[PDB]
């Protein structure tokens, strides 16, 4: 046996949250999981931090390929034998209904039964599926929506930032930067009009109004005005 | 077996609640809970007040650690008479399925298997996982939205106030100084054109049209009127 | 035997890389290693990316302890074969020259030697020091010489950017907001006359003669141009 | 033994040359080393021309990953002569102090101890490093600083062609179309008003005097005329 | 046995802290050292903090009493198993290569060899070189050097600040106080210009371009035009 070392899980996990899920995660799961056992495997996989709807999606191609592979691989009576070893089933090369020890069997056995290797390629398929559907989230990609409030914003902007992989630092230049950059028109033009060194607290007062009657109606009047002066 | 004082308990609490979730929970934690079983760390635990989504976070880490000492540790189905005392299970450390008794036995027996402070990491790696994600709602943050009714605002206000960690005198202070100064312009106005002594059911009712199709008419025809007498 | 987890170790690792090195890693470092022998510390240590600096600082620190423990503690000059281990020295201690059976031993033997409690106290000594000396090196810290090449600020710039723990996207940003942000006066003027649109190769052109001397000699002619207009 | 084919060997030195150390060289390595014995996968490493920087980092993670084999997996006291063989070391996976037979009697033996993929899992960590950190060096980016004189770039220029992988043809139309482009602008205008015709030894006697008294005397004269003329 | 109690331990390493290494602590350590053994002598000494110039010519002083205690006492060939111990040699007198039982032996045997008293002579010799030739470095003696970059003399002063002995408020005022205070006149001109309010960062980008080509002419065009301006 020779289980994952604390390295090569380190390198499994700074790659993912490096490259996000590009497709170079492929290439570097299969160079740092080679003999690994269905456990190795669950151990890598369950490690990952973050990209929650990248985890569930590879989840779903996993149980999809053990279902298929329950389906064509049919259940034995169950008779004794001097090996008595059991043929593994989807769970079982999932590692979800199995021990480190049947693994460890079925792999050295003569015949071998390469669980680890089904587990490799059931994974491999369902990141090959995360490659082409998932786009990972940004702090970059937070943008305050033509009528969406100013807190709410500020709020998914936060909440974003919290699960941003940065230094702090780092994250208190990009609220300096990004926050009020990508607020939309109306209150960005209401933020420039405040100065710079305004607080976040006076920012959120500033832009409480926008959207309501008030500042409807300011608008308004500010746009007719010249086209009445104009004329 | 020594276990938890109420003035310990005490003092975990008021840590808690005074430092909301800080990082310096975390030291303290773990200076008030040294060579406590997984019954004691249960106890500290479910006698914080409030915190509900942070405790539904640090229990979802709790299961977590426990789902994966489940799959790494497997369970032997051969009781033995010499020394019997069964392999601890995840939710065995966590304390959901185990006794005090077995508890004592797990940290006492030859070789010693330390529940409570497997159980303890577990705790420190959900309260990590908590400083670093969660941020705890105040009072001060209860303000209302550009086209949130008062009568809402006022609900939210009050539910807020119910639950913060204020006496009475500090409460009512906190009532006649936040709920007027955090809402919306459009309410703010009728409210300061209210006199400072007016109630709250005459602030509720002098806020009752703001949104309504008389109060956008009269304030689109004020800024109109205004632009105009400008020209 | 309970060795240290791979989720725990993760998790230490992300809270250095998340805290750097601020004082929050003491309680977690301690929160995370309680019971380990010295070689789980010592996984725990060298698992740790970046912070060459504050590592070394760590080693040294370590070192040190060790050195005092072996001049206060005196070897024995004839080993006892029966029902007797080797008096545990500073290396094995830190655990540059012991096994885990020794240390697990050690920890074992009535009466106990606290190999891993006296390497905890010597690792949060050299922590403490860290926090202490050790200021972490960020992308947002690089900045342009006043007489330093645009090429060699460019050429620091990026590999602080290597360095950096962030996504790819997130770099991409630092590069479009931070280079020509931090540079100095001199090129500052250059990369502002050049455009938005330059790209780094035109950017670098551009500025490959500051401080040569045709860029001496306009600059100083472009000065004593303005004072004799002003004449 | 299936050792290394020379087509295999010489197609991965051809797929370092031309792809330098892009991630595409991991998917390859892992393609062309699959059942290598550490000798073979040294061999692929030593046959890597240029690079310097890039092998000496491969080097520096191989040398911590057999350092940390080494720390957690103890050695053996006692020989066992009939029917065994000696635990490999990191040195004995990396194939610094093993021998071929050996390597193979070690992923030939029951149970094997596959060495070779060890010491792969140990090189593609190293390239992956080197991946994230290093660069390489170009033609391209040789250029003259700001204050350098023109020998000394003619040569670092020189030197880097000659490292070059072109064809010579190829390499005097670099010569020929960025020796004088990627000069810096105090000695580009002199190269420029020599003349495309000028020779390497013209041009470098043209450009022996930039820098010193009497052309930055010339240049500041030409300055201060432009701007006394203006006035 | 009387070893050195923790409280004139502690206070030698505040009398050594405070007075720094002026003559007063030479009167200080003959008092609380006097009957100490060249193992409390040794703890005395590797317990004090910083100053490490003054350390090292402590050492190199004992090193050479060492040495020539070494050549005017000669080693003894044989041995004298009864009732006769070692002669001390210049290591064993400076407590290298000696045990705390071989010192007490030392100074307890009849006729007494009182090495304890030669370390303390060699110690104070070293103490007296060091109060004659040692000078502490201070915050108040870091001051930017007439070409230095203000960055390099942040930097400095920052070092020296995180070894300087003080409160934490007092290292603000220290900061607040001093940093632009023993600033060069080039750069103090420019941070006076900028404003007591401004930031460290922007005090540092005001200063990034002094000494380079625009600072230089700028400041020589404005001396120009003043004695232009007087003819
Ligand atoms: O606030 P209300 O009195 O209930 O009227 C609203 C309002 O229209 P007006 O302010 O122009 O009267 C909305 O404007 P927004 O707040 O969304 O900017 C509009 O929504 P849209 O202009 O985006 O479509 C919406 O719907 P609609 O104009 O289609 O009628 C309309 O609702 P009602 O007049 O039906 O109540």
Redesign the interface.
């Given at each position: 046996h020779?289980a994952?070392?604390?390295?090569?899980?380190?390198?499994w996990?700074?790659?993912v949250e490096?490259?996000?899920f590009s497709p170079?995660v492929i290439?570097?799961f299969?160079?740092?999981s080679?003999?690994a056992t269905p456990?190795d495997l669950?151990?890598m996989l369950?490690?990952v931090?973050g990209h929650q709807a990248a985890m569930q999606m590879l989840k779903e191609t996993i149980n999809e390929e053990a279902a298929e592979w329950d389906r064509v691989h049919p259940v034995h009576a169950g008779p004794i034998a001097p090996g008595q070893m059991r043929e593994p089933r989807g769970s079982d090369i999932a590692?979800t209904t199995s021990?480190?020890?049947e693994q460890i069997g079925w792999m050295?056995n003569n015949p071998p039964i390469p669980v680890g290797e089904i587990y490799k390629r059931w994974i491999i398929l369902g990141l090959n599926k995360i490659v082409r559907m998932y786009s990972?989230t940004?702090?970059?990609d937070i943008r305050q929506g033509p009528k969406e409030?100013f807190?709410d914003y500020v709020d998914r902007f936060?909440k974003t930032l919290?699960?941003?992989?940065?230094?702090?630092?780092?994250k208190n230049?990009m609220t300096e930067?990004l926050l009020v950059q990508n607020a939309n028109p109306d209150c960005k033009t209401i933020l420039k009009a405040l100065g710079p060194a305004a607080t976040l607290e006076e920012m959120?007062?500033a832009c409480?109004?926008?959207?309501?009657?008030?500042?409807?109606?300011?608008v308004?009047?500010?746009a007719?005005?010249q086209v009445?002066?104009s004329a």
């Open positions: 020779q994952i070392s604390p390295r090569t899980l380190n390198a996990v700074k790659v490096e490259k996000a170079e290439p570097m299969s160079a740092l080679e003999g456990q669950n151990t369950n490690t931090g590692g021990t480190l020890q050295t990972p940004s702090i970059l409030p807190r936060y919290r699960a941003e992989q940065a230094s702090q630092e780092v230049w930067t959120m007062t409480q109004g926008v959207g309501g009657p008030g500042h409807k109606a300011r308004l009047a500010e007719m005005s009445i002066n």
